[PDB]
Amino acid sequence: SSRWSKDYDVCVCHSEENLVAAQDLVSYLEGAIVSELCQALSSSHCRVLLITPGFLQDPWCKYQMLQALTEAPGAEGCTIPLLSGLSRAAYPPELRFMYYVDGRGPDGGFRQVKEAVMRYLQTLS
Amino acid sequence: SSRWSKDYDVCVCHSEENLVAAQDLVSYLEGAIVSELCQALSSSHCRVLLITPGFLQDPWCKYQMLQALTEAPGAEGCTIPLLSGLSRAAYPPELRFMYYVDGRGPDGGFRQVKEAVMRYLQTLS
């Protein structure tokens, strides 16, 4: 529960087709929030899933999404799904009973994503 | 890890539109395997997800699917996805990196599902 139990405060999960949008989010989050793009050995307090059409199509992305929700946001974790570039009708059904940020919100949803991240950090020692 | 730590050996997860197919599976599993249809207070060793078009469309089904994979099949659990009545092209992408039974297999996939259930039970005291 210690703020320093992890070296990063948040990492962004994205598919290869959204590399630039991910970098913008990382840049937006760090303006202090220490962020980076998620990687294999990546371990942070919060994980932002940049869910886009490309992401939803990629099997590995979906798998990472699953595990990101398996051991995390049950209550003790922090996983923030950002639905971007998608029609709400194409949103993953399971989201109706889960927290997530809509890309149509202010700042492409970045503002609410950052806010959600900060809220979690405060609950840390 | 005790075979009697749970009152049921397996329960079937289905959407309202597949009630009959679920009952057939339950019936098939018990011919000893103690099975039933999954319910809110339901707790068993294995959980069979009867994934069909209706299931994939229903938000609550998907959510239950998620949680069924969140705390389960990481290694210590038992969750068996049965893809039935669907074109493989419409299968959830995350399945490419996970175990699952195809409905096109022998006995509508029931045989392999039962086998998978038994395998898990043996690993129990």
Author numbering:
A (entry chain A), B (entry chain A): 79 to 109, 128 to 221
Reproduce text from the manuscript describing this model:
Mal, which is also identified as the TIR domain-containing adaptor protein (TIRAP), is essential for the TLR4 and TLR2 signaling pathways. Mal acts as a bridge adaptor to recruit the MyD88 molecule to the activated TLR4 dimer on the plasma membrane. The C-terminus (residues 80–221) of Mal, referred to as Mal-TIR, is the TIR domain and is required for interactions with TLR4, TLR2 and MyD88. The overall structure of Mal-TIR consists of a central five-stranded parallel sheet (βA-βE) surrounded by four helices (αA, αC-αE) on both sides.
Among these, D96N, E132K, R143Q and E190D have been reported to cause a loss of function in Mal. The D96N mutation has also been shown to impair recruitment of MyD88 to the plasma membrane and to influence the post-translational modification of Mal. To further understand the molecular mechanism underlying these associations in the Mal-TIR mutants D96N and S180L, we determined the crystal structures of these mutants. These structures showed that neither mutation interferes with the overall structure of the TIR domain. We also found that the surface electronic potential map and hydrophobicity of the Mal-TIR D96N mutant does not obviously differ from that of the wild-type protein. Our observations are inconsistent with the recent conclusion based on an in silico model that the D96N mutant fails to associate directly with MyD88 because this mutation affects the distribution of negative charge on the MyD88 binding site of Mal. Our direct binding assay also showed that Mal-TIR D96A retains the same binding affinity to MyD88-TIR and TLR4-TIR as that observed in wild type, and the D96N mutant is capable of binding with MyD88-TIR. Additionally, the D96E mutant, which retains the negative charge at that position, results in the complete loss of NF-κB activation. Thus, we conclude that the loss of function in Mal D96N is not caused by interference with the interaction between Mal and MyD88 but instead by another mechanism, such as altered post-translational modification of Mal. We also showed that D96N and L165A can bind normally to MyD88-TIR.
